[PDB]
Amino acid sequence: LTTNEYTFNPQLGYISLQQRLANDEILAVAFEYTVGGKVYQVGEFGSDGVDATVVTGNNSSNQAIITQSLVLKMLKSNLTNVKNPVWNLMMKNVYQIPQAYQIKQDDFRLNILYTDPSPINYITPVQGSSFPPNPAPDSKVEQTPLLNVFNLDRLNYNNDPQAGGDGFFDYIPGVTVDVQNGRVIFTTKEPFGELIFNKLQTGAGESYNDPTTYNANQQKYVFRNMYRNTQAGALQDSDKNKFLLRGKYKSSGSNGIPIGAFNVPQGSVVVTAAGRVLVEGIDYSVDYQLGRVQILDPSLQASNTPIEVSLENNSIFGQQTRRFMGFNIEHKISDKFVIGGTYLKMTERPFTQKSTYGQESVNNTIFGFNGNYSTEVPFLTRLANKLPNIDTDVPSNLSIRGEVAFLRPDAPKASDFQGEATIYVDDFEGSQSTIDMRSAYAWSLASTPFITSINDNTFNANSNTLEYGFKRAKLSWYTIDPVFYSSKPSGISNDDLSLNTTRRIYSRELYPNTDIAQGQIQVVNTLDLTYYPGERGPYNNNPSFGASNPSANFGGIMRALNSTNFEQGNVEYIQFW
Amino acid sequence: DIERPITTGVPFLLVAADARAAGLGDQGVATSSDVFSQQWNPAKYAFAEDAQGLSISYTPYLTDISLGQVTYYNKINDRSAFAGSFRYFGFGGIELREPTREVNPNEFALDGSYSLKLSETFSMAVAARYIRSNLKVATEEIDASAAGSFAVDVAGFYQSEEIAYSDFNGRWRAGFNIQNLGPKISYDHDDLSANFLPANLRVGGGFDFIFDDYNKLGVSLELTKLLVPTPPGSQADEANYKKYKDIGWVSGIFKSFGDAELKEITYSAAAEYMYQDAFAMRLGYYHESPMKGAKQFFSLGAGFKYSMIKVDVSYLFSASKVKNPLENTLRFSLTFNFGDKYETY
Amino acid sequence: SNTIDVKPTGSVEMDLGVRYTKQDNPAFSPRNRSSLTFDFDQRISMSLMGKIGTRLEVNANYDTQFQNLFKLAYTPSIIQKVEVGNVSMPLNSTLIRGAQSLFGVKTQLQFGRTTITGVFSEQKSQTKSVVAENGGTVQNFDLYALDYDNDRHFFLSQYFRNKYDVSLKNYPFIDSRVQITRLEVWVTNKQNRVTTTGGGNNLRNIIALQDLGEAQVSGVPDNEVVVISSTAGFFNNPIDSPTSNTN
Amino acid sequence: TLPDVEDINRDNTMSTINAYYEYSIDVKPGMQVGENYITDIREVTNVDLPNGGTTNARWIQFKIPVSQPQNTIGNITDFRSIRFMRMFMTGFNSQMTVRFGALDLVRGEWRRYTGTLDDGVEFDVAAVNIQENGTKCPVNYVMPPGVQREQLYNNNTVINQNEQALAVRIGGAGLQYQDSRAVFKNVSVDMRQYKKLKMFLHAESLPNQPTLEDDEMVGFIRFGNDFTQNFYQVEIPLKVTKTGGSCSISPDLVWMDDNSIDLALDLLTRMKIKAMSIDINSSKRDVNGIYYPDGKLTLGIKGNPNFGLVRNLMVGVKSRADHKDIKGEVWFNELRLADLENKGGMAAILNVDTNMADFATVSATGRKSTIGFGSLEQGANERDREDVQQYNIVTNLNLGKLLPKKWGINLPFNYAIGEEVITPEYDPFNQDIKLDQLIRETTDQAEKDNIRTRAIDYTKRKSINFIGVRKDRDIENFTFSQSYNQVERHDYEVADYEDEQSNSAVNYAYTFQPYLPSNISFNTNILRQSNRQQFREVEVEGIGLDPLYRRNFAFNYQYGFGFNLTKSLKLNYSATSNNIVRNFLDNSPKEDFNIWDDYLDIGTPNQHAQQLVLNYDIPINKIPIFGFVKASYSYTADYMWQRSSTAFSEYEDPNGTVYDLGNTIQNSNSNTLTTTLNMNT
Amino acid sequence: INQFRSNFDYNSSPKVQDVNTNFYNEIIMSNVNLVEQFSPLIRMDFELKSSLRVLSEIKKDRALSMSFDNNLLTEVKGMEYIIGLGYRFKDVSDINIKADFSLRNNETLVRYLDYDNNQLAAGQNIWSLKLTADYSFSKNLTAIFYYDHSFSKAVISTSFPLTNIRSGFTLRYNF
């Protein structure tokens, strides 16, 4: 791995790979560090290791090539055994802030909560638990906020220690945060698992290595199965995954608030600064080409108020056809006083009647009123210029606006089920996602198999001599190419393309209920496996092969699966027809 | 929710390709003679009051797929005309994951039609199409090089001279079109499996009111019958489909009527309003059976004529049923006319 | 009344051609030899302007590369305006804030002083929003205990692992002395390729051991530090020495 | 065109290890739909061969469960590293062609639940499917009655989409008296607008087994946060579809309406309320603390689950056969939610804008909303669930206008008040119950007032500021400022919150004009930030948690000394400094402090950053012998000093001694000469 | 030298030899890269008598990348022949012809030192023959006949030599 395909905190010793090798790769390391004046090394480098190759000859028919291996250290093998300590070498205290950038301090608020029913941010005992008394000043899980419970808040704003803490996540750019890309790093090998155990512990009879000897209070919080078991495992240990850590990070905002839409349709943005809408030209300005709303309101500029912005983008690729029926009466009472209508009906049109959860259709109808009485108050302008040095005669206005805007929602009657507003939280239609395997070429010959155990030699599978493929018949895997069916090559009678082992199975036989598209492949390819248990197969110097009962020979074909870890793939069945 | 539709072989043929139609309810069978009328009623090329024209249309399918037609008519006498159309349904853009192979799937349908003027009122035309689909361009046990076939068309178009009614002196138009009549297509290149061609029996009429003699408003109706046998709705459940599939096309075109009523005839109505003949505002409602095709809409459209180029555009408000792949588009079509303005009586 | 002056501008392009392509991999059939697909391309990039009949007003912009616009206005001398195609419907309320980009019909009707502007049309937008605080675009995140980062962060040995949570008792000062000077990482080479511009073409056999280094730590048992089944006569250093090849 | 390596998966190594999982299909001439792993047979009768003939073909569908190996060859434990699927065909006597219509590793989405809710019980989870399993042996998969087929256009053609279900299949020794088996997925479904949660079910005896009776099977739809500590178990005693042999039972007898959950969600809340007053220790909590209240469901709750956090769906199969081994083939299907809340909303925006002739621009606002008001595009779970009472008041004055235009000033004086009062429709604890059903559920007013006070979200924000004050024309050309933002808030989480910002900048920026400095720039800005938080204790609304004080008291300033000493020297100089203030502490802060305490203080330094940039365009042209070289030179030097927070400055050894690990220093240089030497001799 | 290092082993000890046998070089390193490049080895702008524009470059380069881990170098090649070509038929009206032949070759030989095993590891022989000829029928209407031939070639045995040909006219109408 080039030095740009990973990082490493060169003081605590954890690699920070940049590609998430998670399909049973192998990942070795050789490194060299210095504890002060001494130099250590637990690998073997290229510029230190035994040379790559070593020849011991002069001609191609007497050379003796010797390649050499460069002993290293292993950080995760192919077969992810959970027991072995290479599993533990993986680091499970790094949480990646989703879609993060150089997350500068003061624009990053992290906060750990305990959503048992709902998000509460202090741990409570269970029915007489009463957490171990007289805690140290550091552990003290009695009422402390979760950031203090998790030893992740102990420093002031300036990163110098404070009594209980600043109340906020500490953000030490080496220790607790990888500022370049997300990655809040908790300051423990396994915070949720053993930090809480040792911080709730109530004696020495409790031990972390056996989940049966827990406090009955650290039996509800110690989430041991995400550290002693994979992430696809520990789904079955579900009663403990309630420690979400909400947070907020901000973008650069250097030029302006980057809305996230491009080529906005003009007059659409509505920047309600602190609840009150802002005027499109007096206190903010939009680019309309880049997003980048820019508040030129100096008081409201530097205020830290949450300026929210509604955008009305028009870059929807793949949405539902909407209809926008409506109108608005606009009556003019005596000048500078109007009244409004504004009936509106926005109706989605679902793709299918089976409106899934999240992709729901709306049928909303708003109808409102208006107001907007204007006036000049020359009384008040006179009051103004009846003051000290003030002189101006510029007019004064007292506009007054009001609205009501009732809303009545619905759901479009297309997406009804027997006269209702079903949403289909799970129609069991996405389950059973398949992975094809009848690719006639991706297979190949197979080693001689074992049958009952690793101890039987029914197929000579342990014979280390040439008596290894004696029991290999003449299996031949293939698919009858379409030339035979379409344009009969000279020699194959039409009574050969018809004997039920070579027929060009149409999909109208397997799947008579499926509606094949037009112009697409109507023909169900196969993976024919013609097995000849008397034909000597490929390589074997079987001397007799004439008394061998053909019910003893095999014919083998092995593939290589693209995706390992059927746990987190959830492979369940091997289907075939 | 449609039960038991009819798998009409190559389906791109049915969809309109222009804007003079498909902004008018997809009919064009009793619409005035125009450069687009080759998919709808090739007979009415004889009544074109120009010598020769050619046009390019385009429908985008914003799902970059596209459907584009290029036509050229040229009436030799004052009494006959030739025409040639070319529809191209393409999946514009492709790549095969270091030069990589480029494979554009496409379904062009070349076409050419003669149109003679039998009597002074209605004309008859005969057309021929080489349909060719190549959608399944692919690799390793799904072979490309899919074939097409040939289809014949027979169209009659009855223009009427003039009647000068009570206060609006309109004229009448009628016309029938027997669409694709060719041997069934086999995508898989077998003889034991082949899809019927999309034979149509579209019959339409229309009347246009005339105001000021160059300010006209014409309405019209079309009835489209899809002349393929309807599929039969489990040994019997297999034998019934076998009897459906072993039907010849010349006999299916005859049968065509053993549904299982039979009012699964798609009807469309539309109105023209062309002002001075260089501007037109097309309205049209199209309706198929919600059980036998599930497709209906409320097409709007407009058309402009600067000097000899007409720009026709149109939108396709989807009336009720399932998501139509063209509902938010603009069927942009464009024309060109040449000299020899003919005097249409 | 007269003066249909709709003057189109722009260009049109047709690309009627043939496209032959053939590979020569043997795995294909003898049928997939030499595909010969026709090819057809259009590049209509037009725009219409003009003011028909002194009242109507055409405007349009049709490009063959999403936002193809088509407005068709109208202005009488009881009917004020009738657009089609790019109606707006501004409707300044701050509660009933209607859409502003949408295809369809828009009318208007002045009955003395009671304008009844109404729109039927198809909205073509989404109305997404942001919550920009000081700076820009506060965007929240919500993780959990169990969805940490997958196998992408690794300790470098059991020594650093067991020393991690103790060297960080007082965060900013790290109670250690370590300094990883040099570090080489070796992954399985699933993509058989050779480069010079990637940094080099240096790749060797590897026999990466599991217990390489790992002098036994004081706290945890030996069965969790070292995988060797019998550690008897295996360690040749004290019970806390750092990871080196000679532990 | 690839060589025939002994390396299949291109890992570049061989991996001669043997860790298998065998799965042995038989190949016999019989094979009805029960025994080996068959699921369908789909016999065809008359296929048209190309020679005009006709054959009788079968399409026996095997479906082997990966999670039930028959043997294990070698030290294999679990399916975390699988590779090299190797099929081989033994036992035959002669020519044998097997044609795989679709060989497939099908991965579910539903994850069989392991653990008590291991004795031999073959629990399987397939998806019965109408396109494939329309010919199954026990019962043909017929779509449930109301369910349509979900039309769709591929390219100018309808394409009937698919329909599936689940195939929770019990075998082996079968379930015991209450040992159940379940299947769970994960979700964030918020079912609080919709008023009924209902899904079909289907029961079936097993082929070649003792037929089930019309009991001893249940719906068992644990949902909510959890599977053993927070859930809403719906249940239903199924009744088997009586099979006779037709194998094509009609849809109304497959998907019986007695095996179809209804479960109006408004009953779950009353169950939750009835069970809040029934402790976790009692005999009501039956065995696993499920509290069955002892239509046709037997609902159960175990500890206040939620809606909107309905993660961990678990559909399953639980036995209630008093003494028998159950072996069923339950199908689950469409799990939709019934009709929703069509009630509406209401808003009352009222704005008031005034002017006082260029002097004051007092605005005012205020908008009152109700539960359910959003916008048109607002979905069903995102419209509104909070009564809201915004108001705002901005009072931009212009104080400089009060004095004469001579010696004019710019005192803007923005002043903004305003706040939010929000009451959620649902109380922020027991998220699914509403505030009303809990305020009207107890006569414990000491606790009733804990409720509806731990739920009234409240803010308030003051903002005074004088941004832009200066005297328009060592002259009087400063530029002052001042800003002050207070925020208070006492929502459900924080009992009281406090923010104070008090930026107080000031700038100089002379910019000289004719060896003296060409420019001078300077500026300071006190930045005080003060925050309090008291996270409320939701049990009793009394004292709450300890307050947490954040303080960012900082002073910091700039310089700049742009000199143009000659025509061939352009040396700038921009120092900067940023020191902190620590009036408010050792490590025990002072909860007696103030933002407007000693304010012009200049505390301890925190960062100091020099910077120098001198450019010298080498006056060698003066020498009238080398006047052909455009030699320049540039030297930017930098310097920075960090503070190294007190965890270093008074690090104390475990020996007890306190060291001082100092605070770092940095340089940098950018020597840069770019000569020309235009040969002009 | 992409990154040289200081060797901790070349310190002071009485241990001057490494594993195989060497003297612990002071400057560890890896991947010494000699990059040679004739960018236009020759370029021959050839504006001819009437109008026969010609521009025939010849690019070329080598990328020796010897790595000291395995001690085997990797040589890469250039050979990017190019032949531009332009002409204008007159008043037939005017017909502008362009022709852009090009031929890119490559190699990625991995050469061992201690025995002759210099083995190929990549490559290309792509040559393309774009060729256009356009003709205007009026101020508005133009046509252009284009012909884009292209042929790859198997340098390594996993490339599947392509040959693909675009042709046909393209009209053009400028309003």
Side-chain angles (χ1 to χ4, degrees), chain B residues 191-209:
Chain B
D191 293 330
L192 296 176
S193 68
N195 299 114
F196 289 161
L197 284 173
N200 287 314
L201 191 142
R202 67 180 64 253
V203 173
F207 178 78
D208 54 352
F209 311 97

Short mmCIF file of all heavy atoms in Angstrom, two decimals, chain B residues 191-209:
data_model
loop_
_atom_site.label_atom_id
_atom_site.label_comp_id
_atom_site.label_asym_id
_atom_site.label_seq_id
_atom_site.Cartn_x
_atom_site.Cartn_y
_atom_site.Cartn_z
N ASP B 191 -37.92 -20.89 -34.93
CA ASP B 191 -39.20 -21.03 -35.60
C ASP B 191 -40.30 -21.51 -34.67
O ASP B 191 -41.48 -21.44 -35.02
CB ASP B 191 -39.07 -21.99 -36.79
CG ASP B 191 -38.19 -21.44 -37.89
OD1 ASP B 191 -38.15 -20.20 -38.05
OD2 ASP B 191 -37.53 -22.24 -38.58
N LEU B 192 -39.93 -21.99 -33.48
CA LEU B 192 -40.89 -22.50 -32.51
C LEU B 192 -41.28 -21.45 -31.48
O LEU B 192 -41.88 -21.79 -30.46
CB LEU B 192 -40.32 -23.73 -31.81
CG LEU B 192 -40.08 -24.93 -32.73
CD1 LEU B 192 -39.43 -26.08 -31.97
CD2 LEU B 192 -41.38 -25.38 -33.37
N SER B 193 -40.94 -20.19 -31.73
CA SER B 193 -41.35 -19.10 -30.83
C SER B 193 -41.22 -17.80 -31.60
O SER B 193 -40.11 -17.44 -32.00
CB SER B 193 -40.48 -19.07 -29.59
OG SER B 193 -39.17 -18.67 -29.93
N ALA B 194 -42.33 -17.11 -31.80
CA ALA B 194 -42.30 -15.86 -32.54
C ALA B 194 -43.47 -15.00 -32.11
O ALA B 194 -44.57 -15.50 -31.89
CB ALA B 194 -42.33 -16.12 -34.05
N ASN B 195 -43.22 -13.70 -32.00
CA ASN B 195 -44.21 -12.74 -31.55
C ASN B 195 -44.93 -12.15 -32.74
O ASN B 195 -44.34 -11.92 -33.79
CB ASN B 195 -43.54 -11.63 -30.74
CG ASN B 195 -42.84 -12.15 -29.51
OD1 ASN B 195 -41.62 -12.08 -29.41
ND2 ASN B 195 -43.61 -12.66 -28.56
N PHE B 196 -46.23 -11.89 -32.57
CA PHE B 196 -47.01 -11.27 -33.62
C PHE B 196 -46.55 -9.83 -33.84
O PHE B 196 -46.11 -9.15 -32.92
CB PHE B 196 -48.49 -11.29 -33.27
CG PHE B 196 -49.10 -12.65 -33.33
CD1 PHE B 196 -50.29 -12.91 -32.69
CD2 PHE B 196 -48.48 -13.67 -34.02
CE1 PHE B 196 -50.85 -14.16 -32.74
CE2 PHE B 196 -49.05 -14.91 -34.07
CZ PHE B 196 -50.23 -15.16 -33.43
N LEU B 197 -46.67 -9.38 -35.08
CA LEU B 197 -46.43 -7.98 -35.38
C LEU B 197 -47.60 -7.13 -34.90
O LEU B 197 -48.72 -7.62 -34.75
CB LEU B 197 -46.23 -7.76 -36.87
CG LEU B 197 -44.88 -8.18 -37.42
CD1 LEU B 197 -44.90 -8.07 -38.92
CD2 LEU B 197 -43.84 -7.26 -36.85
N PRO B 198 -47.36 -5.86 -34.67
CA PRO B 198 -48.42 -4.97 -34.18
C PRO B 198 -49.34 -4.50 -35.29
O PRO B 198 -49.34 -3.35 -35.72
CB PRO B 198 -47.61 -3.82 -33.57
CG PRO B 198 -46.39 -3.77 -34.38
CD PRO B 198 -46.06 -5.19 -34.73
N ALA B 199 -50.16 -5.42 -35.79
CA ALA B 199 -51.13 -5.05 -36.80
C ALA B 199 -52.17 -4.12 -36.19
O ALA B 199 -52.65 -4.34 -35.08
CB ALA B 199 -51.81 -6.28 -37.38
N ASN B 200 -52.50 -3.06 -36.91
CA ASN B 200 -53.48 -2.08 -36.46
C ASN B 200 -54.57 -1.93 -37.51
O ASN B 200 -54.33 -2.15 -38.70
CB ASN B 200 -52.84 -0.72 -36.21
CG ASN B 200 -51.99 -0.70 -34.97
OD1 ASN B 200 -52.40 -1.20 -33.93
ND2 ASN B 200 -50.80 -0.14 -35.08
N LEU B 201 -55.75 -1.54 -37.06
CA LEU B 201 -56.86 -1.28 -37.97
C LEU B 201 -57.43 0.11 -37.70
O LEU B 201 -58.62 0.30 -37.52
CB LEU B 201 -57.92 -2.37 -37.83
CG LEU B 201 -59.07 -2.47 -38.84
CD1 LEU B 201 -59.36 -3.93 -39.08
CD2 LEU B 201 -60.33 -1.83 -38.32
N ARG B 202 -56.56 1.12 -37.67
CA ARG B 202 -57.00 2.40 -37.15
C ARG B 202 -57.91 3.09 -38.15
O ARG B 202 -57.53 3.32 -39.30
CB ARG B 202 -55.81 3.28 -36.79
CG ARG B 202 -54.98 3.74 -37.96
CD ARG B 202 -53.83 4.59 -37.49
NE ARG B 202 -52.91 3.83 -36.66
CZ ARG B 202 -52.81 3.97 -35.35
NH1 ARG B 202 -53.58 4.85 -34.72
NH2 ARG B 202 -51.95 3.24 -34.66
N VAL B 203 -59.13 3.41 -37.72
CA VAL B 203 -60.14 4.02 -38.57
C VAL B 203 -60.58 5.32 -37.93
O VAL B 203 -60.98 5.32 -36.76
CB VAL B 203 -61.34 3.08 -38.77
CG1 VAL B 203 -62.44 3.80 -39.52
CG2 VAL B 203 -60.91 1.84 -39.51
N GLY B 204 -60.53 6.41 -38.68
CA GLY B 204 -60.83 7.69 -38.08
C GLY B 204 -61.54 8.60 -39.05
O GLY B 204 -61.60 8.36 -40.26
N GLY B 205 -62.09 9.67 -38.49
CA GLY B 205 -62.76 10.69 -39.26
C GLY B 205 -62.58 12.03 -38.58
O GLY B 205 -61.97 12.12 -37.51
N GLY B 206 -63.12 13.06 -39.20
CA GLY B 206 -62.96 14.39 -38.65
C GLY B 206 -63.61 15.42 -39.54
O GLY B 206 -63.83 15.20 -40.74
N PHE B 207 -63.91 16.55 -38.93
CA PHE B 207 -64.52 17.67 -39.63
C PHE B 207 -63.86 18.94 -39.15
O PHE B 207 -63.71 19.13 -37.94
CB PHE B 207 -66.02 17.74 -39.37
CG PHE B 207 -66.69 18.89 -40.03
CD1 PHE B 207 -66.99 18.86 -41.38
CD2 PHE B 207 -67.00 20.03 -39.31
CE1 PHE B 207 -67.59 19.93 -41.99
CE2 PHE B 207 -67.60 21.09 -39.92
CZ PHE B 207 -67.90 21.05 -41.26
N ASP B 208 -63.45 19.81 -40.07
CA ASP B 208 -62.85 21.07 -39.67
C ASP B 208 -63.72 22.23 -40.13
O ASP B 208 -64.04 22.35 -41.31
CB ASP B 208 -61.42 21.22 -40.20
CG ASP B 208 -61.34 21.03 -41.67
OD1 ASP B 208 -62.37 20.63 -42.25
OD2 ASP B 208 -60.27 21.28 -42.26
N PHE B 209 -64.14 23.05 -39.17
CA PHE B 209 -64.83 24.28 -39.44
C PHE B 209 -63.82 25.28 -40.00
O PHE B 209 -62.67 25.32 -39.56
CB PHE B 209 -65.44 24.83 -38.15
CG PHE B 209 -66.22 23.81 -37.37
CD1 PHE B 209 -65.63 23.13 -36.32
CD2 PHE B 209 -67.53 23.52 -37.69
CE1 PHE B 209 -66.34 22.19 -35.60
CE2 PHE B 209 -68.24 22.58 -36.97
CZ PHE B 209 -67.64 21.92 -35.93
#
